[PDB]
Amino acid sequence: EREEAVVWDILDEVIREHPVLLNRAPTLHRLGIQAFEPVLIEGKAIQLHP
Amino acid sequence: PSQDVVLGLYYMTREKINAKGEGMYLTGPAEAEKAYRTKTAELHARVKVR
Amino acid sequence: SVTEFLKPRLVDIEQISTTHAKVTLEPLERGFGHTLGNALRRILLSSMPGCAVTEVEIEGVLHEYSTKEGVQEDILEILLNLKGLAVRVAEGKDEVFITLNKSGSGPVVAGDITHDGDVEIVNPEHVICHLTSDNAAIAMRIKVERGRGYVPASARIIGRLLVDATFSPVDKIAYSVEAARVEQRTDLDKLVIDMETNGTLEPEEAIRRAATILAEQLDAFV
Amino acid sequence: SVTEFLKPRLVDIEQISTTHAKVTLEPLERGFGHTLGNALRRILLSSMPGCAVTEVEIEGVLHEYSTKEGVQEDILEILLNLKGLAVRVAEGKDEVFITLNKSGSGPVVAGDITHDGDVEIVNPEHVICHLTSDNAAIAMRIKVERGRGYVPASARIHERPIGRLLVDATFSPVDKIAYSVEAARVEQRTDLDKLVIDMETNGTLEPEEAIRRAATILAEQLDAFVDLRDV
Amino acid sequence: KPLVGTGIERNVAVDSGVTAVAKRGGVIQSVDASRIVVKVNEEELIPGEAGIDIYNLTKYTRSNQNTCINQRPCVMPGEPVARGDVLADGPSTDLGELA
Amino acid sequence: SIKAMLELADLPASGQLTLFDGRTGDAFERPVTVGYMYMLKLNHLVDDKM
Amino acid sequence: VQDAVEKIGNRFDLVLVAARRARQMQSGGKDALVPEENDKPTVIALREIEEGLITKDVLDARERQEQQE
Incomplete structure (x- = not known):
């Protein structure tokens, strides 16, 4: 909650190679949900590969 | 690819008549890059390349 | 301080061959990767x-x-x-x-x-x-x-x-600028230079000479 | 000769107004005007x-x-x-x-x-x-x-009353920077150039001082390349 | 203001009610970020009236969409004003034009 | 009328200028349409949607 | 993961085998047969499968040996 730095290093280590699932509605086919490796970025928006 | 990727690959591969550096002989892709970066030849110059 | 700037701390030189090299510098201030890379490329x-x-x-x-x-x-x-x-x-x-x-x-x-x-x-x-x-x-x-x-x-x-x-002697020079972070500053710059020379000089020596030319061009102002 | 270049020098400051100035660097070789101008614009x-x-x-x-x-x-x-x-x-x-x-x-x-x-x-x-x-x-x-x-x-x-x-x-303090590379008349050679930097600021920073600070930053950053080694 | 417009902005700004429009003409006696007091002309005064108009401006009031409703004065003390002239500009208004 | 207004302000009649890359200083190969456009900030904010 | 699916043949069986290996390394005390290189157990299991050290038959044989001991 206090958002210390070591929390940020721990977060990097947990997300190091943990894939996440991205989805967009409507899910017309199975390509509407795909797994990506996350890269932590400053901001509030998800960056998507073109 | 779509949109800007296609447009860039199209523009870079187009062919222009009497562009700067026409008829030049290049040792390979590396020297084509060197000629483009040194403003010797244009992107659309007709050359002979090994 | 206002005159204190980040200097590279991790410098990695990987020698693919006797005429090919890849030099990575990190971290750099925001926007300095492009400045240094473009200047070195034009000089080389x-x-x-x-x-x-x-x-x-x-x-x-x-x-x-x-x-x-x-x-x-x-x-x-x-x-x-x-x-x-x-x-x-x-x-x-x-x-x-x-x-x-x-x-x-x-x-x-x-x-x-x-x-x-x-x-x-x-x-x-x-x-x-x-x-x-x-x-x-x-x-x-x-x-x-x-x-x-x-x-x-x-x-x-x-x-x-x-x-x-x-x-x-430079046959090919390319540079890419990627992200790099120290502490919570995620806007820092990392510079990767892939270089290939004809064999007259090693790529590292060529980078050294290009940097020397650039530095000596500014001697009247520093 | 070929291995030795001519180092540019500060030749003129023109103060158009309190917030507008022009700085002239001369002489410069072929291609060095654009390189120095872009580097100085990005640093400034x-x-x-x-x-x-x-x-x-x-x-x-x-x-x-x-x-x-x-x-x-x-x-x-x-x-x-x-x-x-x-x-x-x-x-x-x-x-x-x-x-x-x-x-x-x-x-x-x-x-x-x-x-x-x-x-x-x-x-x-x-x-x-x-x-x-x-x-x-x-x-x-x-x-x-x-x-x-x-x-x-x-x-x-992050107390604050x-x-x-x-x-x-x-x-x-820098608002706008422009740079132009023109021909230079030095001795007998014609390959030399001249760089004119137009600076629009808020008037707090002198033009010459700004140029020297930018050059110092560039030299300090190049010092890493001049001594390339694994760190 | 929009540099390229259509000429309709004044109508929307005036008829939306967000601005403070002068009910009677006169000279702006007092201006402040929350008040405009105007001295009405002699020719348009009702018999036996005080002769002065007071406009209290809305300052940093929440809207229905959690936005800001602020009215800023656009006049000077002593400036002549007629009927229908804009005295304060509401949100998204610049000198009586929708912005 | 638009072109006449452009000539009054000493601007190109095509509305296109020559622009330079700030990263390199090299001019772009074609003129670019540069002007002024009225933009709006819609009430779809990433702060309220993250 | 083309090498892993080539070594196994079926993506689903590969997922099952890698899951068993990762659970062995995480929940159990089993150690990795390849350099970890600061990688998660799932990826290390995938790398072991790609190298041919870990298969379903190998896991079953090791389980039988553990049961015998």
Whole structure:
């Protein structure tokens, strides 16, 4: 909650190679949900590969 | 690819008549890059390349 | 402080080969990766001193569009091969002449050139052209100058045929700028330079000389 | 010769106005004009130190979303006006406090700020606020700090009494940079060039000093390349 | 203001009610970020009236969409004003034009 | 009328200028349409949608 | 993961085998047969499968050996 730095290093280590699932509605086919490796970025928006 | 990727690959591969550096002989892709970066030849110059 | 800036802390030089290298510097201030990379690239491609073949004489050849019997390659192809011939000239000499004479059948190469000891050929296995008939002979008088950058034949416009001047030892330079973070500052810059030279110098030495030229150009202001 | 270049020198400063100047570098070789111009433009536009207003304290004011009697502009507008203050602070001080007290109808401008001799106001005609009544009075305490870049109030690290109003600080004095490479007439050669840098700033930073600071930054960053080794 | 417009902005700004429009013409006696007091002309005064109009401006009031409703004065003390003239500009208004 | 207004302000009649890359200083190969456009900030903020 | 699916043949069976190996390394005390290189157990199991050290038959044989002991 206090958002210390070591929390940020721990977060990097947990997300190091943990894939996440991205989805967009409507899910017309199975390509509407795909797994990506996350890269932590400053901001509030998800960056998507073109 | 779509949109800007296609447009860039199209523009870079187009062919222009009497562009700067026409008829030049290049040792390979590396020297084509060197000629483009040194403003010797244009992107659309007709050359002979090994 | 207002005059304190981030200097690179991780510098990694990976040598793919004796003429290819990749230098990674991290971290850099925001926007400095492009500044340094572009400046170094312009210096290394258009302002680096070096030695290269400039002019040629071939017996019986008057124009670059003329034909010579016994050689497989056309004259313009021969000039193209002469372009990519790495040479070192001893310091203090700004013009040298080398000769190449060969009769027979087979590939005539750069190692068949006789010099005066002040010229070193980095690539003796480089193929100059190919003689097809046993009765065919090639006589060649090559001029090597010292200059800066990449001066093409068209910009320099008797039987003297001009060869594109590849003075700079740099054959390829590319740079990419990626993200890098220290602490919570995620806006820092990391610079990756992939470099390939002809063999006259190692890529690291070439980067050193380019940086030296840039730094000395600013001496009157620092 | 070929291995030795001609180092450029500072040959001319032309002061068009308080906020506009031209700096001439001569002589330059082929291609070096563009290289130096682009490097100097990127360094000048990004990494130039300056002074800016950071905190304001106005008597009788608790927050920015408020109004003061006799003042036509809201406190938000007054802070936005103070953001455009051009202040030069004498070397050795990274912090200073100035005061602004004014009573009576009229435009309250930057020339009404009382400084301690180590602070120079570059734009006295800059209008800070308006007093629309003869009984109106304004009393403000302004904090000026030295810095570099753009430091928003939210990004400042976190007691603060109620009444102290934070102001977003844009420390960089450089507003616009242009550069042109023209032909140079030196001795007998024709390959030499000349670089003209047009600088539009807020008047706090001298042109020559800006050029030398940019060159120093560039040289310091190149020092890493001059000594390339695994670190 | 929009540099390229259509000429309709004044109508929307005036008829939306966000601005403070002068009910009677006169001279702006007092201006402040929350008040505009105007002295009405002699020719348009009702018999036996005070002769002065008071406009209290809305300052930093929440809207239905959690936005800001602020009215800023656009006049000077002593400036002549007629009927229908804009005295204060509401949200998204610049000198009586929608912005 | 638009072109006449452009000529009054001493601007190109095509509305296209020559622009330079800030990262390199090299001019773009074609003129670019540069002007002024009225932009709006819609009430779809990433702060209220993250 | 083309090498892993080539070594196994079926993506689903590969997922099951890698899951068993990762659970052995995480929940159990089994150690990795390849350099970890600061990688998560799932990826290290995938790398072991690609190298041919870990198969379903190998896991079953090791389980039988553990049961015998």
